[PDB]
Amino acid sequence: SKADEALRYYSAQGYTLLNNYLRDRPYKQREAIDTLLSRSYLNDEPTSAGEFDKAMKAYVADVEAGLAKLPASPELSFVYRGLALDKPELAALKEQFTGVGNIVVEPGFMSTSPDKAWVNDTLLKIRLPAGHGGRLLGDAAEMLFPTQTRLRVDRVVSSTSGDFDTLLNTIPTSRIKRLIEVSVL
């Protein structure tokens, strides 16, 4: 079905385009339009801003329903994601991510891994509740999450406090300033 192939295009290359659009970070407005026409979401050049977003959302929807159609893996309990929080432009996110009890909403599709986390300034040990939206990709290791999944900040460990070492080694890796334990709501 079209739903499944939408997930694959996103997975193979469309992600940087789509995620940037969804996080409302800067992106190449042309490429996205070319993509929509390429994938028959729009039949002709968009005459308005309304047309563009409508189409763009319909595209997101197809990836989501595509990601939903997969089988859940309730054996998994923890997943991990490396994060570059210390960059000056992202200090808005950094402030939210460090606050214990703060809710963080990832508007795009959250990329994670059950196996390890790519080394950065921030590592996320992500707790997983029963019946979550996150799916293992495999053929499409990587677990991806549908648009606007909710995160609760449970615990923030800086390199100063002794808690750093004992928690770190429960996170497979491959400069790390902060370890952040977070639950998916």
As annotated, the active-site residues are 81, 111, 142
* Residue pair 113/79 in contact by the 8 Å Cβ criterion: yes
CA distance 174 to 81: 12
Please give the torsion angle defined by the CA atoms of residues 31, 32, 34 and 35, in that order, rounded to the nearest 10 degrees.
120
Length of the chain: 185
